[PDB]
Design a protein around this ligand. Structure first.
Ligand SMILES: O=C(NCc1cccc(-n2ncc(C(=O)Nc3ccc4c(c3)C(=O)N=C4)c2O)c1)Nc1ccccc1
Ligand SMILES: [Ca+2]
Ligand SMILES: [Cl-]
Lengths: 247, 57
């Protein structure tokens, strides 16, 4: 996250850190005690699915404070329409091997209904994006979780003010000062409405974070609510990676 | 009704035939008798931040 601030410990309790062989891979969002939403591209190069770990209740990567909860990832589900190395359909649904325990430091973000998200949440201007990603373009990643308030653009305005499909939205700033960044992909774009927070976007990727003339690109979660809900009602399948038809 | 100001619902809104609307709440919440408000029914409902909810309690 470029140009944000430290998320005070416990204020982003849905944030997930994804690790592969102990190394930071991506972020994610907890939406229930066994389900995490992330970005499909996070998984393009995984060789051994057994070494993927999700961590909830994380804050300062330098220390263990006892609020962290680690889980193996049992299933990584990607839409059939996602093509590795690209932006469109950049979403993944992750089933944990065992539920996390909800606590003051581990709470799911609400996955909204599609209508509500389209009719209401899409018009809330500012939302929060978070992660342990790079603090600057070509810079070191963060040791404490960072958060940034970003404004959402209508797609016509994004194209003017700068490919952007109906499966994405732009949010952020065109001056290079404030953006999500490498190391944040998969993390939440969370939107507040009347006292509750909801998942509206996933940090995706483009050519380079914090670039003058370019906004951050987020997966438009409202397009996937039915897809996600159906998968959460399904039984697990052998083999970690599952490609699931979309729509 | 639901397309305008969320139908007055705090959370989710469905239109029905007539001038009819029903609000609904996510799992872990119940709808109050006002027909619009949602109140938690569990300790850790989705989308609430416990350290901030207890700072305001
Ligand atoms: O290598 C592949 N996947 C494995 C992978 C895993 C984890 C992270 C990554 N990964 N690498 C670079 C970034 C990255 O820059 N993320 C960004 C974040 C926020 C923003 C921006 C970019 C931006 O421009 N504005 C805001 C990223 O997220 C890749 N796939 C593949 C590449 C080429 C060809 C085929 C497949
Ligand atoms: Ca820690
Ligand atoms: Cl496997």
């Amino acid at each position: 996250i470029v140009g944000g601030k430290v998320c005070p410990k416990g204020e982003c309790p849905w944030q997930v850190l994804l690790l592969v062989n102990g190394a930071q891979l991506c972020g994610g969002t907890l939406i229930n005690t066994i389900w995490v939403v992330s970005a499909a591209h996070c998984f393009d190069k995984i060789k051994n699915w057994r070494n993927l770990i999700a961590v909830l209740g994380e804050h300062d990567l330098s220390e263990h404070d006892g609020d962290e909860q680690s889980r193996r990832v049992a299933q990584v589900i990607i839409p059939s329409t996602y093509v590795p190395g690209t932006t469109n359909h950049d979403i993944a649904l992750l089933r944990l091997h065992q539920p996390v325990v909800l606590t003051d430091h581990v709470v799911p973000l609400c996955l909204p209904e599609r209508t509500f998200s389209e009719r209401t949440l899409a018009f809330v201007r500012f939302s929060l994006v978070s992660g342990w990603g790079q603090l600057l373009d070509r810079g070191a990643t963060a040791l404490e979780l960072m958060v940034l308030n970003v404004p959402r653009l209508m797609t016509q305005d994004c194209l003017q003010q700068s490919n952007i499909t109906e499966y994405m939205f732009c949010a952020g700033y065109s001056d290079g000062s404030k953006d999500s960044c490498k190391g944040d992909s998969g993390g939440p774009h969370a939107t507040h409405y009347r006292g509750t927070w909801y998942l509206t976007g996933i940090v995706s990727w483009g050519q380079g974070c914090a670039t003058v003339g370019h906004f951050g690109v987020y997966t438009r979660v409202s397009q996937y609510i039915e897809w996600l809900q159906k998968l959460m009602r399904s039984e697990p399948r052998p083999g970690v990676l599952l490609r699931a038809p979309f729509p | 009704i639901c397309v305008n100001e969320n139908g007055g619902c705090e959370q989710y809104c469905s239109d029905h035939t007539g001038t009819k609307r029903s609000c609904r709440c996510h799992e872990g919440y119940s709808l109050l008798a006002d027909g619009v408000s949602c109140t938690p029914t569990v300790e850790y409902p989705c989308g609430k931040i416990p350290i901030l909810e207890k700072r305001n309690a």
